[PDB]
């Protein structure tokens, strides 16, 4: 287990998301589905030049899995996945610039729903989640588990859990008052409204 401090800007963005009064919390789903779609595009683009990349899974899809018992919503995709380096770099200087621009825009009157336009849409997960876990598997590396309850730090460990071939899984440990995102009619309503034009199949699982 390795513990890391978030960069100053990201820690700042995260406490801003957790402490600002915002009712339109549903925007997290579109942001996560969007990131899933980008990873799926990346693996499909790599299979033109190298068809052997689809060996770890041929199917390109997105699964939405609510679990009322664990109070979790899981967003699984069979995209390109992330290596330990890709994972560390994505929480690094690449995000720093977008984070500062978005926080500057929020002062000027921009709302939290514009987060994706600055490439930091992942952090909207903290509008509904008290903890976020990210399990990822890339063809060129091992399976990794990333975790943060915010608080200025995150952990990275080699995942000992069930293998997933290739892709990324985002597990949102929902706040007690956010269990509406476990409901079928509510997830359907959000996906139909915010992510109706995704070039990949999205399956909402039942309980
Ligand atoms: C405007 N840009 C923003 C970053 C965009 C991007 C999209 C996808 C991925 N890859 C390769 C993923 O495997 C993946 C990551 C995901 C995250 C972020 C997890 C975090 C711990 C913060 C690194 N959330 N949901 C995900 C679903 C995914 O399949 C990396 C970057 C690329 C475009």
CA 172 – CA 80 distance, rounded (Å):
21
CATH fold, domain 1-207, is Heat Shock Protein 90 (3.30.565)
CA of 104 to the centre of ligand 1 (A): 23
CA angle (7 as vertex; 6, 12 as ends), nearest 5: 85
Cα atoms in the 13 Å half-sphere on the side-chain side of 183: 9
- The CB density around residue 182, as the number of other CB atoms within 10 Å, is 18
Pocket probe for ligand 1: among 9, 35, 116, 202, the residue whose CB has the most ligand atoms within 8 Å is 35
The atom number, within ligand 1, closest to the CA of 136 reads 13
Q: How would you classify residue 55: left for phi > 0, otherwise alpha for psi between -120 and 50, otherwise beta? A: alpha
The ranges assigned to domains in the chain are 1-207
Q: What is the resolution of this structure in A?
A: 2.4
The atom number, within ligand 1, closest to the CA of 154 reads 21
**Residue with tokens 């899981």, as numbered in its chain:** 74
Q: How far is CA 94 from the centre of its chain?
A: 16
């Amino acid at each position: 287990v390795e513990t890391f401090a978030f960069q100053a800007e990201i820690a700042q963005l995260m406490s801003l998301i957790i402490n600002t009064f915002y009712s339109n919390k549903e925007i997290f789903l579109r942001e996560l589905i969007s990131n899933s779609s980008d990873a799926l595009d990346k693996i499909r683009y790599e299979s033109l030049t190298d068809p052997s990349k689809l060996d770890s899974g041929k199917e390109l899809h997105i699964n939405l899995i609510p679990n009322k018992q664990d109070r979790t919503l899981t967003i699984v995709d069979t995209g390109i996945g992330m290596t330990k380096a890709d994972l560390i770099n994505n929480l690094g200087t690449i995000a720093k610039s977008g984070t500062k621009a978005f926080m500057e825009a929020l002062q000027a009157g921009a709302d939290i729903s514009m987060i994706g336009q600055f490439g930091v849409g992942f952090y909207s997960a903290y509008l509904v989640a008290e903890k976020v876990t990210v399990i990822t598997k890339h063809n060129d590396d091992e399976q990794y588990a990333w975790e943060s309850s915010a608080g200025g730090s995150f952990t990275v460990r080699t995942d000992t859990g069930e293998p997933m071939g290739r892709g990324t899984k985002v597990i949102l440990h929902l706040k007690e008052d956010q269990t509406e995102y476990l409901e079928e009619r509510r997830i359907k309503e959000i996906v139909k409204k915010h992510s109706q034009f995704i070039g990949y199949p999205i399956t909402l699982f039942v309980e």
